[PDB]
Scaffold this active site. Structure first.
Site, mmCIF file in Angstrom:
data_model
loop_
_atom_site.group_PDB
_atom_site.id
_atom_site.type_symbol
_atom_site.label_atom_id
_atom_site.label_comp_id
_atom_site.label_asym_id
_atom_site.label_seq_id
_atom_site.Cartn_x
_atom_site.Cartn_y
_atom_site.Cartn_z
ATOM 1 N N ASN A 2 2.904 3.820 -13.631
ATOM 2 C CA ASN A 2 4.235 3.912 -13.051
ATOM 3 C C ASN A 2 4.892 5.197 -13.512
ATOM 4 O O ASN A 2 6.094 5.392 -13.327
ATOM 5 C CB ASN A 2 5.049 2.714 -13.415
ATOM 6 C CG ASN A 2 4.469 1.430 -12.807
ATOM 7 O OD1 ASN A 2 3.756 1.490 -11.776
ATOM 8 N ND2 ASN A 2 4.733 0.262 -13.447
ATOM 9 N N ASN B 265 13.829 -9.874 -4.975
ATOM 10 C CA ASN B 265 13.017 -8.976 -5.803
ATOM 11 C C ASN B 265 12.773 -7.663 -5.094
ATOM 12 O O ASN B 265 12.867 -6.591 -5.678
ATOM 13 C CB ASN B 265 11.672 -9.617 -6.124
ATOM 14 C CG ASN B 265 11.029 -9.055 -7.388
ATOM 15 O OD1 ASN B 265 10.648 -9.820 -8.263
ATOM 16 N ND2 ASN B 265 10.900 -7.729 -7.489
ATOM 17 N N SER C 212 0.842 -1.180 0.000
ATOM 18 C CA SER C 212 0.000 0.000 0.000
ATOM 19 C C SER C 212 0.880 1.233 0.000
ATOM 20 O O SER C 212 2.034 1.187 0.435
ATOM 21 C CB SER C 212 -0.916 0.017 1.203
ATOM 22 O OG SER C 212 -1.922 -0.938 0.995
ATOM 23 N N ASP D 61 8.811 -2.141 -16.721
ATOM 24 C CA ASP D 61 7.387 -2.053 -16.453
ATOM 25 C C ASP D 61 6.888 -0.617 -16.621
ATOM 26 O O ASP D 61 6.173 -0.062 -15.736
ATOM 27 C CB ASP D 61 7.127 -2.547 -15.044
ATOM 28 C CG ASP D 61 5.664 -2.758 -14.749
ATOM 29 O OD1 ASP D 61 4.882 -2.990 -15.711
ATOM 30 O OD2 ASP D 61 5.313 -2.696 -13.528
ATOM 31 N N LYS E 126 5.568 3.539 0.336
ATOM 32 C CA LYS E 126 4.975 2.231 0.074
ATOM 33 C C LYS E 126 5.318 1.303 1.211
ATOM 34 O O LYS E 126 6.483 1.183 1.604
ATOM 35 C CB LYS E 126 5.465 1.653 -1.236
ATOM 36 C CG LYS E 126 4.814 0.307 -1.640
ATOM 37 C CD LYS E 126 4.756 0.228 -3.188
ATOM 38 C CE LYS E 126 4.436 -1.160 -3.824
ATOM 39 N NZ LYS E 126 3.819 -1.002 -5.252
ATOM 40 N N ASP F 285 7.997 3.360 -9.425
ATOM 41 C CA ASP F 285 7.877 1.923 -9.340
ATOM 42 C C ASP F 285 9.011 1.094 -10.001
ATOM 43 O O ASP F 285 8.822 0.443 -11.044
ATOM 44 C CB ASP F 285 6.504 1.473 -9.885
ATOM 45 C CG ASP F 285 6.055 0.155 -9.274
ATOM 46 O OD1 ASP F 285 6.922 -0.729 -9.037
ATOM 47 O OD2 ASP F 285 4.850 0.028 -9.010
HETATM 48 C C1 P91 Z 1 -0.249 5.045 -6.427
HETATM 49 N N1 P91 Z 1 0.597 6.264 -6.331
HETATM 50 C C2 P91 Z 1 0.169 7.559 -6.462
HETATM 51 C C3 P91 Z 1 -1.225 8.051 -6.754
HETATM 52 O O1 P91 Z 1 -1.769 7.316 -7.536
HETATM 53 N N2 P91 Z 1 -1.872 9.163 -6.284
HETATM 54 C C4 P91 Z 1 -3.270 9.562 -6.601
HETATM 55 C C5 P91 Z 1 -3.334 10.486 -7.836
HETATM 56 O O2 P91 Z 1 -3.093 9.783 -9.089
HETATM 57 C C6 P91 Z 1 1.374 8.390 -6.291
HETATM 58 BR BR1 P91 Z 1 1.356 10.368 -6.463
HETATM 59 C C7 P91 Z 1 2.468 7.544 -6.081
HETATM 60 C C8 P91 Z 1 3.849 7.798 -5.862
HETATM 61 C C9 P91 Z 1 4.729 6.745 -5.683
HETATM 62 C C10 P91 Z 1 4.234 5.433 -5.703
HETATM 63 C C11 P91 Z 1 5.172 4.286 -5.512
HETATM 64 C C12 P91 Z 1 5.210 3.295 -6.538
HETATM 65 C C13 P91 Z 1 6.050 2.179 -6.432
HETATM 66 C C14 P91 Z 1 6.880 2.070 -5.299
HETATM 67 C C15 P91 Z 1 6.827 3.041 -4.273
HETATM 68 C C16 P91 Z 1 5.976 4.157 -4.384
HETATM 69 CL CL1 P91 Z 1 5.960 5.348 -3.050
HETATM 70 C C17 P91 Z 1 2.872 5.181 -5.950
HETATM 71 C C18 P91 Z 1 1.955 6.233 -6.114
HETATM 72 C C19 P91 Z 1 5.998 7.366 -5.536
HETATM 73 O O3 P91 Z 1 7.092 6.704 -5.344
HETATM 74 N N3 P91 Z 1 5.980 8.712 -5.593
HETATM 75 C C20 P91 Z 1 4.646 8.972 -5.790
HETATM 76 O O4 P91 Z 1 4.264 10.200 -5.866
#
Ligand code: P91
Ligand code: CL
Length: 258
Positions: A139, A50, A20, A134, A36, A151
């Site tokens: 992403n 991984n 999450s 990916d 995350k 990601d």
């Molecule tokens: C799902 N998401 C969203 C989002 O959907 N917000 C609602 C508007 O569309 C953000 Br901004 C976001 C963000 C990240 C990740 C994320 C990915 C993979 C690994 C680790 C992380 Cl921390 C996921 C993210 C991130 O690293 N920096 C972000 O701003």
């Protein structure tokens, strides 16, 4: 717990199978981050490796304007956490769905600009002898808007002989066929499809007849008028022969992008 003690959790912005993602404010520096939080895989197992590669990749892809900055990663006590830059404009995926509901997509100027920037993010990654594997709108994240690749969960070394596949909607065939001679070009393939989505195409297919057509190098219907040159750039980016697709370096030096 460090997560609780060091941050104020604002909102959940992402929910996966494994993890999450939260919008949080670091108590000490007043500043907002995306964190995350995901299950800690068993010490010294395929899944652990991984997750560690992700941390490793974020830790070397931190100087770049077109890659989400990494601040920290820690483990406690059955969870693994990574603290990244927060992107105030959210994901490319959500902008594209909003766009789709309103019948107003990225204009050609905007699509070139998305392709150039993300292309710059890839050039970097590939020059670190890595590949992302990916690339897709969910992403890519947005902060003049800045697009930033996020990601790194599939990131691997360029000459890896074992690979986890990205989303099938964005997956070059040669990778599906376990051919890993030109991985950098898998990202090129996925970038083009990402930009195709940005232009207002229907949701991409996961399998079946329409999945193969594209992999023949045929573009999905794009609901707007793009210049022929730009459409050609796009087509060559999904060419069945990965060697025929331009490297990221070629990509950002391409005339159509000047
Ligand atoms: C799902 N998401 C969203 C989002 O959907 N917000 C609602 C508007 O569309 C953000 Br901004 C976001 C963000 C990240 C990740 C994320 C990915 C993979 C690994 C680790 C992380 Cl921390 C996921 C993210 C991130 O690293 N920096 C972000 O701003
Ligand atoms: Cl997506």
């Amino acid at each position: 717990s460090r997560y609780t003690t060091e941050f104020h959790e604002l909102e959940k912005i992402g929910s996966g199978e494994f993890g999450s993602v939260f919008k949080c404010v670091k108590r000490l520096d007043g500043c907002i981050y995306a964190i995350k939080r995901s299950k800690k895989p068993l010490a010294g197992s395929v899944d652990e490796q991984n997750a560690l590669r992700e941390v490793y990749a974020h830790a070397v892809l931190g100087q770049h304007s077109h890659v989400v900055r990494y601040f920290s990663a820690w483990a406690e006590d059955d969870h693994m956490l990574i603290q990244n830059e927060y992107c105030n404009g959210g994901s490319l995926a959500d902008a594209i769905s909003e766009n789709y509901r309103i019948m107003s997509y990225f204009k050609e100027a905007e699509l070139k600009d998305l392709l150039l920037q993300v292309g710059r993010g890839l050039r970097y990654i590939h020059s670190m002898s890595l590949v992302h594997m990916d690339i897709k709108p969910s992403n890519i994240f947005i902060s003049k808007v800045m697009f930033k690749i996020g990601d790194l969960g599939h990131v691997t070394r360029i000459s890896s002989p074992q690979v986890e596949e990205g989303d099938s909607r964005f997956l070059a065939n040669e990778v599906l066929q376990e051919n890993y001679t030109h991985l950098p070009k898998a990202d090129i393939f996925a970038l083009a499809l990402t930009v195709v989505c940005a232009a207002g195409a229907e949701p991409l297919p996961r399998n079946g007849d329409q999945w193969h057509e594209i992999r023949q190098g045929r573009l999905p219907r794009i609901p707007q008028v793009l210049s022929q040159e730009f459409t050609e750039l796009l087509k060559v980016m999904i060419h069945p022969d990965p060697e025929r697709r331009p490297s990221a370096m070629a990509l950002v030096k391409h005339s159509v992008l000047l």
